[PDB]
Each structure stands twice: as C-alpha cells, then as structure tokens.
Scaffold this active site. Structure first.
Site, PDB file in Angstrom:
ATOM      1  N   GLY A  16       0.827  -1.206   0.000  1.00 61.63           N
ATOM      2  CA  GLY A  16       0.000   0.000   0.000  1.00 61.63           C
ATOM      3  C   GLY A  16       0.857   1.249   0.000  1.00 61.63           C
ATOM      4  CB  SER A  17       0.092   4.643   1.282  1.00 58.11           C
ATOM      5  OG  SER A  17      -0.882   5.013   0.340  1.00 58.11           O
ATOM      6  N   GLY A  19       4.815   0.573   3.796  1.00 58.83           N
ATOM      7  CA  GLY A  19       5.175  -0.784   4.186  1.00 58.83           C
ATOM      8  C   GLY A  19       4.779  -1.816   3.145  1.00 58.83           C
ATOM      9  CB  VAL A  21       0.075  -6.449   3.108  1.00 58.78           C
ATOM     10  CG1 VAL A  21      -0.884  -7.480   3.722  1.00 58.78           C
ATOM     11  CG2 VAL A  21      -0.279  -5.033   3.554  1.00 58.78           C
ATOM     12  CE  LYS A  36       0.481  -0.292   6.374  1.00 62.19           C
ATOM     13  NZ  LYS A  36      -0.478   0.851   6.514  1.00 62.19           N
ATOM     14  CG  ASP A 131      -5.064   6.206  -1.370  1.00 62.89           C
ATOM     15  OD1 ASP A 131      -5.146   6.804  -2.469  1.00 62.89           O
ATOM     16  OD2 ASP A 131      -4.177   5.371  -1.162  1.00 62.89           O
TER      17      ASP A 131
HETATM   18  O1  LIG Z   1      -1.175  -0.926   3.215  1.00 64.97           O
HETATM   19  C1  LIG Z   1      -2.106  -1.108   4.016  1.00 64.97           C
HETATM   20  O2  LIG Z   1      -2.401  -0.317   4.941  1.00 64.97           O
HETATM   21  C2  LIG Z   1      -2.884  -2.399   3.927  1.00 64.97           C
HETATM   22  C3  LIG Z   1      -3.150  -3.054   5.136  1.00 64.97           C
HETATM   23  C4  LIG Z   1      -3.857  -4.238   5.157  1.00 64.97           C
HETATM   24  C5  LIG Z   1      -4.271  -4.843   3.976  1.00 64.97           C
HETATM   25  C6  LIG Z   1      -5.026  -6.112   4.041  1.00 64.97           C
HETATM   26  C7  LIG Z   1      -5.812  -6.539   5.076  1.00 64.97           C
HETATM   27  N1  LIG Z   1      -6.377  -7.765   4.792  1.00 64.97           N
HETATM   28  C8  LIG Z   1      -5.965  -8.151   3.559  1.00 64.97           C
HETATM   29  N2  LIG Z   1      -6.320  -9.283   2.940  1.00 64.97           N
HETATM   30  C9  LIG Z   1      -5.816  -9.451   1.723  1.00 64.97           C
HETATM   31  C10 LIG Z   1      -4.938  -8.540   1.092  1.00 64.97           C
HETATM   32  C11 LIG Z   1      -4.432  -8.799  -0.288  1.00 64.97           C
HETATM   33  C12 LIG Z   1      -4.456 -10.075  -0.849  1.00 64.97           C
HETATM   34  C13 LIG Z   1      -4.018 -10.301  -2.148  1.00 64.97           C
HETATM   35  C14 LIG Z   1      -3.566  -9.257  -2.921  1.00 64.97           C
HETATM   36  C15 LIG Z   1      -3.544  -7.984  -2.395  1.00 64.97           C
HETATM   37  C16 LIG Z   1      -3.985  -7.756  -1.101  1.00 64.97           C
HETATM   38  C17 LIG Z   1      -4.587  -7.370   1.769  1.00 64.97           C
HETATM   39  C18 LIG Z   1      -5.109  -7.148   3.037  1.00 64.97           C
HETATM   40  C19 LIG Z   1      -4.017  -4.198   2.765  1.00 64.97           C
HETATM   41  C20 LIG Z   1      -3.315  -2.992   2.719  1.00 64.97           C
HETATM   42  C21 LIG Z   1      -3.071  -2.324   1.382  1.00 64.97           C
HETATM   43  C22 LIG Z   1      -1.919  -2.876   0.548  1.00 64.97           C
HETATM   44  C23 LIG Z   1      -2.552  -3.792  -0.484  1.00 64.97           C
HETATM   45  C24 LIG Z   1      -3.911  -3.259  -0.732  1.00 64.97           C
HETATM   46  C25 LIG Z   1      -4.252  -2.309   0.414  1.00 64.97           C
END
Ligand SMILES: O=C(O)c1ccc(-c2c[nH]c3ncc(-c4ccccc4)cc23)cc1C1CCCC1
Length: 267
Positions: A16-17, A19, A21, A36, A131
C-alpha cells in the site's frame, strides 16, 4: 518463511502507501491473516511517526463488514519493525486500473453498494479515508468488498474535516484540493469525488481524467468536462450518478445519504 511469535510470515501479497503486506499463518488458531509490516526508521527518513499510531487508533475503532478488521498490533519499543495483523480478504483487489476487463453495470452496482455502506460507516465514525480507489477495495470469500489501506486516513471532530491540503492518489483527488491558493475544503466531499472516480473506473476500466504529465492531470481534473465513451454504452441513470459525484463544485456535489437513494443504486 519466518516466525514472529505465533505467526509464520510467508509471501508478500500487497504493497500500500506504506510498508508491505504479507500472508501470515497463526499456529495458535490455525488461521491465515494479512500482516502489514512497517519500519519505524524508514518512516522517519521518509518524513525527512505518530501518524502510524493514529492509523492504529482509527482501525481499532472500526468494525464493519465492508471495512478491514485489525486484530492485533505487535510493537516492541526496542525493535525497528511494527506489525499490524488484519483478517485476510483472500481474493484481493477488485480491480487495478487500467484494465481490459471492466465490470458490468450489475457487478459495479453490487460493489458500489458495498462501498457506500463502508464509507457511510467511516464517515459516521468521523473518519475520512482519503485514498478510495479500486486497488484499495478488497474482495472477500463472501464476494463483498472491504475498504483497506488506512495509511493516509484522518479522524475529525464535529461534522466534517476542515482541510487546507490533503494526501491522496493524484488521479482520484478532487479539484478543490489541487488549487494553488490557500483554501479550506470538506474532507467528506473528497471521499465522494474519489468514489465517483472509482465508479467510473469500475465500468470503463480507466480513470475519467488522465495524463502522464502531473500538471496536465491536475489541470484536467480542475477544468476538463467529464465525458463518457461511446462503448460500453451505459444507463443514463448511471451517467447521472457519476456526473453528480464528479461535480467540480464540492458545494453542490452529491452527498452520501443522497447516493444511497439514487435510482441507479436502488434498482
Ligand atoms: O497498506 C495497508 O495499509 C494495507 C493493510 C492491510 C491490507 C489487508 C488486510 N487484509 C488483507 N487481505 C488481503 C490482502 C491482499 C491479498 C491479495 C492481494 C492484495 C492484497 C490485503 C489485506 C491491505 C493494505 C493495502 C496494501 C494492499 C492493498 C491495500
């Protein structure tokens, strides 16, 4: 993999913005989570943070089926890394723009309905997301979207956020936020604009205002008339809804309680 208390950390699944995940397996309850990972030192150097603890405070407030669920924070004061464990939303982003496979009107309406529920909830809890975009909307095993990435979200007091500037993804940023002139603007109406851009993307697979040149992108957002292509041919009530969300005047822009009763949404 690597181990972190009861969690086995595996592949990176998103970025994401801030770090990254990772997919994480919790050995205590035999369940997968999304984790994250942030570096405190790297965030400090990015500033040139209390913002992270604000994101955590916001996420701890939120319990809604169209919003991601934070379940644990692992933060050792003598370690560089901070870890936020979320429930896994396993099918990932609804869409990444641009795409050659846009959604049908019916599928867009379904996901847009989820998005309205999530956003009204956030705004009720006095959170502006800032966002909103298709890549931040995750599809769960149940087929519904959850709003993710609260890294630039803000909590306000009173009835709205009074912003003098804002953080966002340029293509999704409202015209009032791109002025070179000291101003104040509504936080909530920013989210609506971005919801409009998002809905346009859902059905066309591209943003309504685009340019590789940032200055021209901004100029188009502020001054280019909204246009729909000839194909795909979409309903007039959907054009109307998008047109009202992408009203360049935030004073007359449609608001969330009105979006929910718009005929496109209610059919
Ligand atoms: O950066 C963040 O603050 C952030 C925090 C948590 C998640 C998340 C929480 N449950 C999730 N299940 C699944 C996925 C996931 C799975 C496959 C592909 C992409 C994302 C991501 C998540 C996602 C993000 C962002 C970065 C990727 C998209 C938004």
């Amino acid at each position: 993999s690597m181990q972190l208390n009861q969690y086995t950390l595996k592949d990176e699944i998103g970025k994401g913005s801030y770090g990254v995940v990772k997919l994480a397996y919790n050995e205590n309850d035999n369940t997968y989570y999304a984790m994250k990972v942030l570096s405190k030192k790297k965030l400090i150097r990015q500033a040139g943070i209390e913002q992270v603890y604000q994101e955590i405070a916001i996420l701890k407030k939120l319990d809604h089926p169209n919003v991601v669920k934070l379940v644990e924070v692992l933060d050792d004061p003598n370690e560089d890394h901070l870890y936020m464990v979320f429930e896994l939303v396993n099918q990932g982003p609804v869409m990444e723009v641009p795409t050659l496979k846009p959604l049908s009107e019916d599928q867009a309406r379904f996901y847009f309905q989820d998005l309205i529920k999530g956003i009204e909830y956030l705004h009720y809890q006095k959170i502006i997301h800032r966002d909103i975009k298709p890549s931040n909307l995750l599809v769960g095993e149940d087929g519904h979207i959850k709003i993710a990435d609260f890294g630039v979200s803000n909590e306000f007091k009173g009835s709205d956020a009074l912003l003098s500037n804002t953080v966002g993804t340029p293509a999704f940023m409202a015209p009032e936020s791109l002025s070179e002139t000291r101003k104040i603007f509504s936080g909530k109406a920013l989210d609506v604009w971005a919801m409009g851009v998002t809905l346009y993307c859902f059905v066309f697979g591209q943003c309504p205002f685009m340019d590789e040149r940032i200055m021209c992108l901004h100029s188009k957002i502020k001054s280019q008339a909204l246009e729909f292509p000839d194909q795909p041919d979409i309903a007039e009530d959907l054009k109307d809804l998008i047109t009202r969300m992408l009203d360049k005047n935030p004073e007359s822009r449609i608001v969330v309680p009105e979006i929910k009763l718009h005929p496109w949404v209610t059919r």
